Design a protein around this nucleic acid. Structure first.
Ligand SMILES: [Zn+2]
Lengths: 135, 105, 51, 204, 106
RNA sequence: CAAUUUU
RNA sequence: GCGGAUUUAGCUCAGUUGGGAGAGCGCCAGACUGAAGAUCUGGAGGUCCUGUGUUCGAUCCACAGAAUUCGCACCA
RNA sequence: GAAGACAUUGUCAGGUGGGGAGUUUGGCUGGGGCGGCACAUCUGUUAAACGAUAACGCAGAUGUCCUAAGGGGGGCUCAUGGAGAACAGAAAUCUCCAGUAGAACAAAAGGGUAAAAGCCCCCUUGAUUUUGAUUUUCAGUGUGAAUACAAACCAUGAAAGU
RNA sequence: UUGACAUUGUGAAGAGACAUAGAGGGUGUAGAAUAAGUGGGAGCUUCGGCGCCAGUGAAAUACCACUACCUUUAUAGUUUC
């Protein structure tokens, strides 16, 4: 799990969120194995990960990474699209399928409160919008 | 109080629709339930932290609780409901209230 | 209430030792081949007051 | 179906060495307890006998005593009173009149043990005087409740074949499958024993 | 608490009008009450059934309904700043004909 | 081995 | 509210397979010595938790109920 | 070198936990607490002869009881007191005689009832079923209580009727 | 703090229960017996045991497919501490 920091464990709130020891970190633990591998080599673009091994303490992973500067990738147009500067640190904005499902993005009759992000569908549905002719 | 048995009341049914002869029992309200509906809207809400959403009840005043008689029939094994007044000792068996001749001295 | 007096000893605040006199590791020989199959004898040079 | 092919009527007529016929006791394990709630009464239907030799030992005020020679043969009217302490014990299952709701303390009182007059702890008396009383080869051997286990349903003698024994054990087992309900323990379906007195059998 | 029941303050309102402690006298049950005539309410202590409340004492109205052994009267009553028609079912012992408006007839 | 008074 | 436990001589203790009323102290009698005082025997012991039912045979069992109980469980 | 599938680590489950965390800690009231409940109800009175009408005013009461103490029908008349009978007496039972209630009616106090609504005997379970209207508190909202009904079926009576 | 599960592998000792060929305990009076079991009631048996007959006890007797917890208990089988 995770343990919210809270010095000596007294969250100073109402009792509805009082405990500390079984709050469970709403993004995925495969996705936490990239920010602590992206910062080790910030000059490379994280492509994707995959599970490999699992003991009782260390969920092992690999992460496939690409040099965006090695000009066999800047040429050879099958993978030049990751050299684009929108994809810089492509993980922490939630873009790999490790993070796509943590954001919970598909379409259907299930995912109403998330199909473009759960902050746009929050924002478009409760902004009052007023026309200059009062409809 | 004493209540005798066999209590021939107006049955209703759809077979007789007049006075046919029953027999009397009281009941118990059974276990509450698991997997019901309103309980599923309790252990969905008392889950997690916080605890104790819906009010518990401490201040009690009633002595007895309005004992009730099932009138179960014979002709088709239907039954019915009845509610006499509240009673803190409900004697259901025989024990005929006779002409008490001597009064135990 | 407040934190208690016997709980402020646990962070090295002012409750640490006083160390610029205590002049050595009062520990004996790291076991070797000599102390397992013979001996190696030494002299003392002096005895000192501790701190 | 648990007795359909054999073990009741085909491999029982191979081991018999008594010339005389055989009267089939039963072994089966129905669990009921000291909780006197679910006693083993409602004795079953009676289509066919099991080799009567007993001669019934009572006296009659029956409307059929004008013609009490049809299938029974015992005709003494009620007015024997003082002839029952010790002389006759050839009487285990009997009949009775409806007059004996009145006088029956008189021939009981010291003969309490060996069942030589009826009492409150085994009352027979019957007012049904055509079926049970007009078929007197019907020995009404009881399935009466003792505190642990009375399973004594019989079938036939050692001369009765398979087609005659299609009805005999199958509907006369109505005791242990109409009393046995949610209260009942073991044998919603049975664990049977089929042999009378002589040879081997199969306890499934 | 404060005791305002149903028979409250009717100590003398329902007594049997002293030296007439007896049953009803049978000139009472023979006269009929068709709808459309004035009647007034004088209570009856010996009987208990069908008895009105103590306010309808001496008040008067017209009959709108006749039943097996009872009639019904309508009564105007002050409550605040309007009058109400009131419907009340009285058995026949309480109720006589008043001599106010057959002077108007004669 | 139980055991203490007695004008 | 669930599950288990207790209810006797008058006070205090207890055995009964289900084929017997189990010990002492208050009261009373007798004895032993020269009289006491201790000591001895016998007498005065029972809705036997209140029932009901069971089996050939209920002071003791089965089921039910009133006084006390210990843990447990709490959505009007 | 020790220790070795037990410890440790992770998840779930009971127990322990003012060490901490959050929150309440009735209302009336001759100041507040304290005492009482006058906070929900009922009888009489205060109440000034329709009704309504207050005080921590007065004297009391309730959180129950009843298969009969409900329903019906039939027979009888009570509290007392007088006159007399063996044990019999201030207090026993049996007659006769007066006797408007001075008695009894579950439970506070009023009202009511005499071929009874009281005291005895007989017959039962209307203490049933469907849903509406009406009265008193009332804003003429509701709970509780009661009243006249309609339709069914029952009980009782011989019957009117209840 | 205490259980379970996982990290967690490789081999043996035995213990108690589930589990099964099963062995075998019993208060007067009378039965025959001096008695816990369950029932039809008559024979099977080298025996004539009781003959089912009355003899009498708490239900019969001899007798059986086994009807007593079928305990007292050695054994193959499960899981097992
Ligand atoms: Zn019915």
């Amino acid at each position: 799990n995770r343990k919210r920091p809270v010095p000596k464990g007294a969250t100073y709130g109402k009792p509805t969120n009082q405990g500390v020891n079984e709050l469970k970190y709403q993004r995925s633990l495969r996705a936490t194995a990239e920010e602590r591998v992206g910062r080790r080599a910030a000059n490379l673009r994280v492509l994707n990960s995959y599970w490999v091994n699992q003991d009782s303490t260390y969920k092992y992973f690999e992460v496939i990474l690409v040099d965006p500067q090695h000009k066999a990738i800047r040429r050879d147009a099958r993978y030049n699209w990751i050299c684009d500067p929108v994809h810089k640190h492509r993980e922490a904005r939630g873009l790999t399928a490790t993070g796509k499902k943590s954001r919970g993005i598909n379409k259907g009759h299930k995912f109403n409160n998330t199909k473009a992000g759960r902050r746009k569908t929050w924002k478009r549905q409760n902004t009052l919008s007023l026309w200059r002719y009062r409809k | 109080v004493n209540v005798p048995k066999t209590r021939k009341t107006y049955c209703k049914g759809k077979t007789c629709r007049k006075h046919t002869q029953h027999k009397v029992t009281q009941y118990k309200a059974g276990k509450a339930s698991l997997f019901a509906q309103g309980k599923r809207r309790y252990d969905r809400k008392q889950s997690g932290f916080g605890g104790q959403t819906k009010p518990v009840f401490h201040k009690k005043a009633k002595t007895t609780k309005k004992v009730v008689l099932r009138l179960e029939c014979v002709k088709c094994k239907t039954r019915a409901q009845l509610t006499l007044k509240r009673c803190k000792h409900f004697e259901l068996g025989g024990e005929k209230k006779q002409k008490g001749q001597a009064l135990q001295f | 209430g407040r934190v208690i007096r016997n709980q402020r000893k646990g962070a090295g605040s002012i409750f640490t030792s006083h160390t610029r006199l205590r002049q050595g590791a009062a520990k004996l020989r790291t076991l070797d081949y000599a102390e397992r199959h013979g001996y190696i004898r030494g002299i003392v040079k002096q005895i000192v007051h501790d701190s | 179906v648990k007795e359909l092919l054999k073990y009741s009527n085909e491999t029982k007529k191979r081991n018999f060495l008594e010339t005389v016929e055989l009267q089939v006791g039963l072994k089966n394990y129905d669990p009921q307890r000291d909780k006197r709630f679910s006693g083993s009464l409602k004795l079953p239907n009676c289509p066919r006998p099991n080799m009567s030799i007993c001669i019934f030992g009572d006296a009659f005020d029956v409307d059929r005593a004008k013609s009490c020679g049809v299938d029974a043969m015992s005709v003494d009217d009620l007015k024997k009173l003082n002839k029952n302490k010790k002389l006759i014990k050839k009487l285990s299952k009997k009949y009775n009149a409806f007059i004996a709701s009145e006088v029956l303390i008189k021939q009981v009182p010291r003969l309490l043990g060996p069942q030589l007059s009826k009492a409150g702890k085994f009352p027979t008396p019957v007012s049904h005087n055509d079926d049970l009383y007009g078929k007197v080869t019907d020995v009404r051997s009881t399935i009466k409740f003792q505190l642990k286990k009375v399973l004594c349903l019989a079938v036939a003698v050692g001369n009765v074949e398979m087609e005659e024994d299609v009805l005999v054990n199958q509907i006369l087992m109505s005791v242990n499958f109409f009393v046995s309900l949610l209260k009942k323990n073991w044998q919603n379906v049975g664990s049977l024993v089929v042999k009378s007195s002589m040879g081997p059998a199969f306890r499934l | 608490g404060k005791s305002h029941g149903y028979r409250s303050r009717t100590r003398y309102m329902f007594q049997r009008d002293f030296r007439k402690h007896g049953a009803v006298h049978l000139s009472t049950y023979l006269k009929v009450y068709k709808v459309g005539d004035i009647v007034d309410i004088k209570a009856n202590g010996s009987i208990q059934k069908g008895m009105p409340h103590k306010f309808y004492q001496g008040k008067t109205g017209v009959v709108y309904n006749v039943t097996k052994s009872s009639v019904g009267v309508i009564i105007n009553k002050m409550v605040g700043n309007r009058y109400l028609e009131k419907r009340l079912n009285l058995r026949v012992e309480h109720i006589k004909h008043s001599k106010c408006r057959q002077e108007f007839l004669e």
